[PDB]
């Protein structure tokens, strides 16, 4: 809160997952944000279900893409605020297809009441994150298949195409950076994470930032 915040070092972030061949990054961003906000609201960190969104959220398009803001509003407006545990609705879309939605046989792991859309300003996003926790963001991920580690100091920043989770920042480093959880397994990047320079809208990170509200 200023200087540096890393919510992974606060017990607030679950393990890196794998979206597989499904274009479900929107769902991993939205659920990763809910997992962290649920913990920060005073509940034990629980793994929650991306499959629930890929299969049941009909305001988004399953393995053909979606938006974290639509995903948050589908949970509130159509699923009575419920987010199921990952254990009770496991990921089933690794091959690139979303099975039909099942409405029963699952357990509620978290509930949310709404969502807030954050200012398109990195200093303001950092100020909110420092106090309220991890933020879902959309980025241009064109450069990211060649990311091998370290702080990426220049990033292609043309078109938003990927949704991820901002878990921290460090303004004390040589080049200030953001720390981001991705969904392409631990074999990619720094054990599934990436750091990009902060303060110059690298990869269009300030453009579409939002968070679920629980309470």
From Swiss-Prot:
Q: What else is known?
A: Purified cruzipain is able to degrade itself, yielding a complex mixture of small peptides, and a major 25 kDa fragment.
Sugar-bearing residue positions? 47, 170
Q: What is this protein called?
A: Cruzipain
Q: Which organism is it from?
A: Trypanosoma cruzi
Active-site positions on this chain: 25, 162, 182
UniProt record similarity statement: Belongs to the peptidase C1 family.
Task: Describe the function of this protein.
Answer: Hydrolyzes chromogenic peptides at the carboxyl Arg or Lys; requires at least one more amino acid, preferably Arg, Phe, Val or Leu, between the terminal Arg or Lys and the amino-blocking group. The cysteine protease may play an important role in the development and differentiation of the parasites at several stages of their life cycle.
* Effect on the protein of changing residue 164 to L: In strain: RA
Q: Which cysteines form disulfides? A: 22-63, 56-101, 155-203
């Amino acid at each position: 809160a200023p200087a540096a915040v890393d919510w992974r070092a606060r017990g607030a972030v679950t393990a890196v997952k794998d979206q597989g061949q499904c274009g479900s990054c929107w769902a991993f961003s939205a659920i990763g944000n809910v997992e962290c906000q649920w913990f920060l609201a005073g509940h034990p960190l629980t793994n929650l279900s991306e499959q629930m969104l890929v299969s049941c959220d009909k305001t988004d398009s399953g393995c053909s893409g979606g938006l974290m803001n639509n995903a948050f509003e589908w949970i509130v407006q159509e699923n009575n605020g419920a987010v199921y545990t990952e254990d009770s609705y496991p990921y089933a879309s690794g091959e690139g297809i979303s099975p039909p939605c099942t409405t029963s046989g699952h357990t509620v792991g978290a509930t949310i009441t709404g969502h807030v859309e954050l200012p398109q300003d990195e200093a303001q996003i950092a100020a909110w994150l420092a106090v309220n926790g991890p933020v879902a963001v959309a980025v241009d991920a064109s450069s990211w298949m060649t990311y091998t580690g370290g702080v990426m100091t220049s990033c292609v920043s043309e078109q938003l195409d990927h949704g991820v989770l901002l878990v921290g920042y460090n303004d004390s480093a040589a080049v200030p950076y953001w720390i981001i959880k991705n969904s392409w397994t631990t074999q990619w990047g720094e054990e599934g994470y990436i750091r990009i320079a902060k303060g110059s809208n690298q990869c269009l990170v300030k453009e579409e930032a939002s968070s679920a509200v629980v309470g």
